[PDB]
Structure 1
Amino acid sequence: EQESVKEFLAKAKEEFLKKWESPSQNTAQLDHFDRIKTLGTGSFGRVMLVKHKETGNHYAMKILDKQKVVKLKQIEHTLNEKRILQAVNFPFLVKLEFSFKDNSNLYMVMEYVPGGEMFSHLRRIGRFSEPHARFYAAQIVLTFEYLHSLDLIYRDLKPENLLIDQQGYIQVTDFGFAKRVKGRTWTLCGTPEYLAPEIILSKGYNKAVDWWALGVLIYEMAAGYPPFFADQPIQIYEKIVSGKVRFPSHFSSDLKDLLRNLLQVDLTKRFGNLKNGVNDIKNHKWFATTDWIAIYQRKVEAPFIPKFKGPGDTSNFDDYEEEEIRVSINEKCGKEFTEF
């Protein structure tokens, strides 16, 4: 690669390691914020729009219930999420601004990205044109080049985890499955449609699973539906491990070629995992019109700017029942979360 790229990644790794070895902790508390709206909710956590009472700034606060994290066997994953988020820095990664814990919950206070999930915009428009898909895909390629160089595997690429910012660029959220891995790792995690075959087959797997998931994402952005779709996970998994993929006739020949190499069942033949690494992807004909430096510098005009009224607008997110943020008078699971 160009020495300028090698030196950039060397500095990125130095800066990551300094924060990784000495993580920040306990940098705000709950009563510094007003709660505004629930933006999403799941089996152990939720994300809420909040406003900082002294500065007036808006943030997305991810709240995890310690007891539910323990019950669902997510302790190590939640510790990974916060330790990685406080150590990374890249244009297309959502920034963690504060973190803290109390008797009941863990809190990660992130920048608020008001344009909403890519998923909403994709389903609204139906499918993205190839140039539009390629603009987003280029940002993911650069983000994975960065993360992988730090020995991080992301493991949760899907349209719901990619938010669109005020300039139309991506911000990757949700580091709940991200992990620092030199070599292989073994956990079954991720969403069914996006799982690589070696995850489904319970193998020791590596960063190649992120490049498989990029193939699924590009397919879904350009078609409007994912390549291995079926009604139940076991049926999805059978399709994935066969790897038989059908492409819409409107796909360009270059797009089909790139996707056959990303959706390669044999991980030892998959683009992103060969001797030339990410450069087999960046140099592929489907990306011939991409100016990688201009994307990194955010100098390319985006295909689409989300419609919103200001930094507190929640119109691009949906409506959930509003539940209390209860804090027990007694400390729960203190040992398990000591390092958070």
Structure 2
Amino acid sequence: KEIPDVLVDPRTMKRYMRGRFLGKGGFAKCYEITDMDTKEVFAGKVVPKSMLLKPHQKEKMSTEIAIHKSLDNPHVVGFHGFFEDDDFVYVVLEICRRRSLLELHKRRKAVTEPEARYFMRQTIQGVQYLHNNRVIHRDLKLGNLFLNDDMDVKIGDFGLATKIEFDGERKKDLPNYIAPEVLCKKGHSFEVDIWSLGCILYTLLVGKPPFETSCLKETYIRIKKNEYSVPRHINPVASALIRRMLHADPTLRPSVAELLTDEFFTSGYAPMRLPTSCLTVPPR
């Protein structure tokens, strides 16, 4: 079914002109949308109701919107309202004009140490806010680390995110870099996100995923067993941090707060801004 050229809500009663198709994710298709009065530009996820004909799936999306709406941080995707007409359910989000950290990784392979510091730093900051407000992301990947014209990392996609309700809650229900305890159904918590970060750091510094195999089932074996190695070519202080962040036992992975203070960040060069050049070539 045809998607409207102009998107109006009812709510805020603003008109959104559907512009260039940016891409797709699952059932969602994302278009660049411009505010018809203010000319301000946003990135609107478009989901058809036909995708959420089930009440079960319809929840997962209204769980996600619930959490995202409450968020407000320079390292999280700005949530800017949601609405629906009869055919589609729309979500209006912060435009990130430099794709994600994936497209960067694929085009760059291994990035330099001082870069990964900059990207980790920023990502871990937004992960902190998330944890401070009692949220777990649970599907942290390079495709979720969005970049804008300033090269700022801005965490997105909460389709597998939950918010903890009581003190020491352990979650059992239900992703890319899933932790061992997510697999063994032993019950997960805040420390699954640290594992994703440990992975991301690896993937960045090394140039390939740590549990990267051709077969899907093979991957799940690799993780459970704790089957990885950091190539000798990596800085010891960096491999060290990587190894802690990937520890088998959840209760020994570093806390979000303990990450920033770690030698890795505080030992070598850590630039405060990166040029757009980095999207294709190493910085000089």
Is this a same-fold pair by TM over 0.5?
yes
Shift of 1:180: 0.8
The change in CA–CA distance for 1:67 and 1:202 in structure 2 (over 3 A counts) is: farther
Aligned mate of 1:202, from 166, 185, 188: 185
Give the gaps of 5 or more residues in structure 1.
Answer: 1-24, 273-277, 309-340
Tell whether the 8 Å contact from 2:114 to 2:268 is kept in structure 1 after alignment. Answer: no
**1:265 aligned partner:** 248
Aligned-pair CA distance for 1:105: 2.2
The equivalent of 1:67 in structure 2 is 50
Q: Which runs of 5+ in 2 are unaligned?
A: 1-8, 280-284
Alignment CA distance shift 1:204-1:134 (3 Å): same
Moved more, 54-63 or 74-83: 74-83
How far residue 41 of structure 1 moved from its aligned partner, in angstroms, is 1.4
Shift of the alpha carbon at 1:222?
0.8
Correspondent of 1:145 among 113, 128, 137: 128
- Summarize the alignment of residues 103-252 of structure 1 with structure 2, pairs less than 5 Å apart: 103-182=86-165, 183-188=169-174, 190-191=175-176, 194-252=177-235
Q: 1:109 to 1:290 in 2, by over 3 A?
A: farther
- Alignment partner, residue 15 of structure 2: 32
- Give the paired residue count: 268
If asked which structure has higher relative contact order (CA below 8 Å, sep 6+), I would say 1
2-structure distance, mates of 1:224, 1:73: 38
- The answer (yes or no) to whether the contact 2:68–2:79 under 8 Å persists in 1 is yes
Question: Of Structure 1 and Structure 2, which has the larger fraction of its residues in strand?
Answer: 2
Give the match for residue 266 of structure 2: 288
Residue type at the aligned position of 1:202: K
TM-score normalized with structure 2 length: 0.87
Task: Check whether the contact 1:48–1:60 (CA below 8 A) recurs between aligned residues.
Answer: yes
How much does 1:71 deviate?
Answer: 4.3
Name the CA distance, whole Å, in 2 between partners of 1:222 and 1:73. Answer: 39
Q: CA RMSD in A?
A: 2.4
Q: CA distance change for structure 1 residues 290 and 72 in 2, over 3 Å: closer, same or farther?
A: farther
TM-score by length of 1: 0.73
Whole-Å Cα distance in 1 between the matches of residues 277 and 68 of structure 2?
Answer: 25
- Report sequence identity in percent: 26
